[PDB]
Design an enzyme around this catalytic site. Structure first.
Site, short mmCIF file in Angstrom:
data_model
loop_
_atom_site.label_atom_id
_atom_site.label_comp_id
_atom_site.label_asym_id
_atom_site.label_seq_id
_atom_site.Cartn_x
_atom_site.Cartn_y
_atom_site.Cartn_z
N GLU A 218 9.72 25.12 13.77
CA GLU A 218 10.37 25.43 15.15
C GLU A 218 10.84 27.01 15.05
O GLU A 218 11.19 27.34 14.16
CB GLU A 218 11.86 24.65 14.99
CG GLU A 218 12.29 24.66 16.40
CD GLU A 218 13.80 23.67 16.32
OE1 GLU A 218 14.12 23.43 15.10
OE2 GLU A 218 14.41 23.64 17.61
N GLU B 164 22.05 24.21 24.04
CA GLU B 164 22.34 23.01 23.12
C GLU B 164 24.14 22.95 23.51
O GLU B 164 24.73 23.96 23.31
CB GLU B 164 22.27 23.27 21.75
CG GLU B 164 20.78 23.59 21.42
CD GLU B 164 20.46 23.38 19.81
OE1 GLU B 164 20.70 22.46 19.16
OE2 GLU B 164 20.55 24.61 19.22
O1 LIG Z 1 9.18 14.74 28.63
C1 LIG Z 1 9.46 13.86 29.54
C2 LIG Z 1 10.26 12.68 28.53
O2 LIG Z 1 10.93 13.26 27.81
C3 LIG Z 1 11.43 12.26 26.67
O3 LIG Z 1 12.52 12.64 26.09
C4 LIG Z 1 12.47 13.83 24.78
C5 LIG Z 1 12.12 15.03 25.46
O4 LIG Z 1 10.77 15.19 26.17
C6 LIG Z 1 12.15 16.03 24.16
O5 LIG Z 1 12.36 17.38 24.65
C7 LIG Z 1 13.16 15.69 23.26
O6 LIG Z 1 13.21 16.59 21.97
C8 LIG Z 1 14.52 16.74 21.27
C9 LIG Z 1 14.67 17.99 20.99
O7 LIG Z 1 15.04 18.78 22.20
C10 LIG Z 1 15.57 18.52 19.72
O8 LIG Z 1 15.49 19.65 19.51
C11 LIG Z 1 16.43 20.34 18.48
C12 LIG Z 1 15.85 20.53 17.03
O9 LIG Z 1 15.35 19.23 16.58
C13 LIG Z 1 16.67 21.24 16.32
O10 LIG Z 1 16.13 21.64 14.85
C14 LIG Z 1 17.26 22.37 16.96
O11 LIG Z 1 18.46 22.94 16.15
O12 LIG Z 1 17.75 22.11 18.02
C15 LIG Z 1 16.90 21.54 19.09
C16 LIG Z 1 17.67 21.42 20.21
O13 LIG Z 1 18.64 20.68 20.23
O14 LIG Z 1 15.44 17.28 18.67
C17 LIG Z 1 15.60 16.16 19.15
C18 LIG Z 1 15.46 15.22 17.83
O15 LIG Z 1 14.85 15.59 16.93
C19 LIG Z 1 14.55 15.86 20.14
O16 LIG Z 1 14.64 14.40 20.41
O17 LIG Z 1 13.19 14.33 22.87
C20 LIG Z 1 13.24 13.33 23.83
C21 LIG Z 1 13.65 12.18 23.33
O18 LIG Z 1 14.64 12.11 22.37
C22 LIG Z 1 11.87 10.99 27.24
O19 LIG Z 1 11.72 10.14 26.14
C23 LIG Z 1 10.66 10.42 28.48
O20 LIG Z 1 11.38 9.26 28.86
C24 LIG Z 1 10.39 11.60 29.41
O21 LIG Z 1 9.12 10.99 29.87
#
Ligand SMILES: OC[C@H]1O[C@@H](O[C@H]2[C@H](O)[C@@H](O)[C@H](O[C@@H]3[C@@H](O)[C@H](O[C@H]4[C@H](O)[C@@H](O)[C@H](O)O[C@@H]4CO)O[C@H](CO)[C@H]3O)O[C@@H]2CO)[C@H](O)[C@@H](O)[C@@H]1O
Length: 224
Positions: free
Chosen positions: A120, A205
């Site tokens: 990331e 965030e």
């Molecule tokens: O794309 C459409 C579909 O979306 C699905 O939901 C997903 C989503 O697309 C995806 O973007 C999301 O990812 C998150 C991610 O944003 C987050 O990132 C963190 C990162 O881990 C961290 O190290 C950093 O510090 O901050 C970032 C931002 O907060 O991580 C989390 C957990 O690891 C991810 O889940 O996840 C969504 C699902 O949880 C839908 O599910 C679907 O219905 C739709 O069609």
């Protein structure tokens, strides 16, 4: 607004971009909610916003609503020429626990789901309310005409590199994300020849606070 995405994972896509009400951590909140709005798709960019209020668990992210550039799978980072992007944004208040940040995931597996990757890369444009990035402060880095504080660490098995402004925020920003990947490839052994681009996003965030509103006046992103 053209679209009001107030459901969990409310989604829009068009013009090679997507927009998500990404309330991935909402179950850690005691109260609150959040909606993401599509305001426009003018001039090859996206205009959007998100309004929110969250209470409880101040060290837990509740959400990262974002606009993402849609990409074809299988683009090795080493063979991406450029990732030129610009964003102009505002927050209506700063007495909140929240950031504004680019998020980029890469993985060796080109079909890795979009929720993560092997690596990331974050580029933070704001740091409000005393929150911390992943990991620990490593060193200062000069890129994109600015000085950044590079933080590094791990979130599970994923290595996370976060570039933070040493002070203040950056409400009008442009860069080529390839410059950041190149820095990591050279000086941190980032395996760009083996890693595929998974996501390419900017958003906010949100931990606690509000009512608050993030407005993206304009977002553009390209990939060559
Ligand atoms: O794309 C459409 C579909 O979306 C699905 O939901 C997903 C989503 O697309 C995806 O973007 C999301 O990812 C998150 C991610 O944003 C987050 O990132 C963190 C990162 O881990 C961290 O190290 C950093 O510090 O901050 C970032 C931002 O907060 O991580 C989390 C957990 O690891 C991810 O889940 O996840 C969504 C699902 O949880 C839908 O599910 C679907 O219905 C739709 O069609």
């Amino acid at each position: 607004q053209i679209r009001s995405l107030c459901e969990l994972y409310g989604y829009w896509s068009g013009n090679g971009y997507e927009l998500l009400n990404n309330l991935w951590g909402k179950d850690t909140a005691t109260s609150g909610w959040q909606c993401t709005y599509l305001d426009g798709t003018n001039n090859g960019g996206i205009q959007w916003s998100t309004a929110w209020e969250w209470q409880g668990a101040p060290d837990n992210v509740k959400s990262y609503p974002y606009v993402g550039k849609q990409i074809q799978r299988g683009r090795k980072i080493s063979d991406i020429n450029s990732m030129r992007t610009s964003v102009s944004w505002t927050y209506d208040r700063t007495d909140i626990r929240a950031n504004v940040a680019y998020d980029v995931f890469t993985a060796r597996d080109p079909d890795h789901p979009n929720w993560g990757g092997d690596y990331e890369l974050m580029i933070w444009l704001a740091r409000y309310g005393g929150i911390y990035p992943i990991g620990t402060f490593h060193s200062q880095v000069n890129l994109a005409g600015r000085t950044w504080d590079l933080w590094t660490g791990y979130n599970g098995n994923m290595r996370v590199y976060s570039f933070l402004p040493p002070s203040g925020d950056i409400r009008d920003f442009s860069c080529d994300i390839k410059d950041f990947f190149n820095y990591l490839e050279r000086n941190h052994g980032y395996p760009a020849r083996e890693q595929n681009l998974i996501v390419y996003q900017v958003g906010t965030e949100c931990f606690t606070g509000g009512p608050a509103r993030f407005t993206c006046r304009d977002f553009r992103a390209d990939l060559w």
